[PDB]
Design a binder for this molecule. Structure first.
Ligand SMILES: CCCCC/C=C\C/C=C\CCCCCCCC(=O)O
Ligand SMILES: CCCCC/C=C\C/C=C\CCCCCCCC(=O)O
Ligand SMILES: *[C@@H]1O[C@H](CO)[C@@H](O)[C@H](O)[C@H]1NC(C)=O
Ligand SMILES: *[C@@H]1O[C@H](CO)[C@@H](O)[C@H](O)[C@H]1NC(C)=O
Lengths: 50, 50
């Protein structure tokens, strides 16, 4: 909360206000770099080049 | 996919992933120019000058 600030943060299947009260089973992190217009394509139902 | 890139692309009444599987009846294209803050008003159920 003092260092890193996110322009997009969106959660699917779970309320964002309850992430502090849960425990998670199989956690994986995928990393990549896109341009600014292509961030809207990282979503469950989407079309486009990405 | 090599030339034109869209800042917004949103579809209503259909999932975007199925546009390659369908065939469309009465296609019309409406063209105009707005400013950056007025793009959010091209949606059903909006208020604003546009
Ligand atoms: C020029 C008129 C085309 C009429 C097509 C009619 C129905 C098909 C609907 C949508 C597909 C074409 C729209 C462009 C979508 C760009 C997708 C992308 O690149 O991210
Ligand atoms: C200080 C006045 C308080 C008014 C609140 C009273 C009722 C609320 C109903 C509508 C408020 C709309 C606020 C302006 C919206 C601008 C719409 C636009 O142009 O895109
Ligand atoms: C948060 O960042 C500032 C930046 O210098 C730092 O001084 C502060 O100690 C940090 N907070 C904590 C709890 O470490
Ligand atoms: C896409 O655009 C580039 C731009 O130089 C071009 O070289 C390439 O041939 C285009 N793709 C196709 C399939 O024509």
């Amino acid at each position: 909360y003092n260092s890193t600030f996110f322009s997009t943060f969106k959660c699917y299947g779970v309320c964002a206000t309850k992430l502090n009260d849960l425990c998670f089973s199989n956690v994986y992190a995928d990393s990549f770099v896109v341009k600014g217009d292509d961030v809207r394509q990282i979503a469950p139902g989407q079309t486009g080049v990405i």
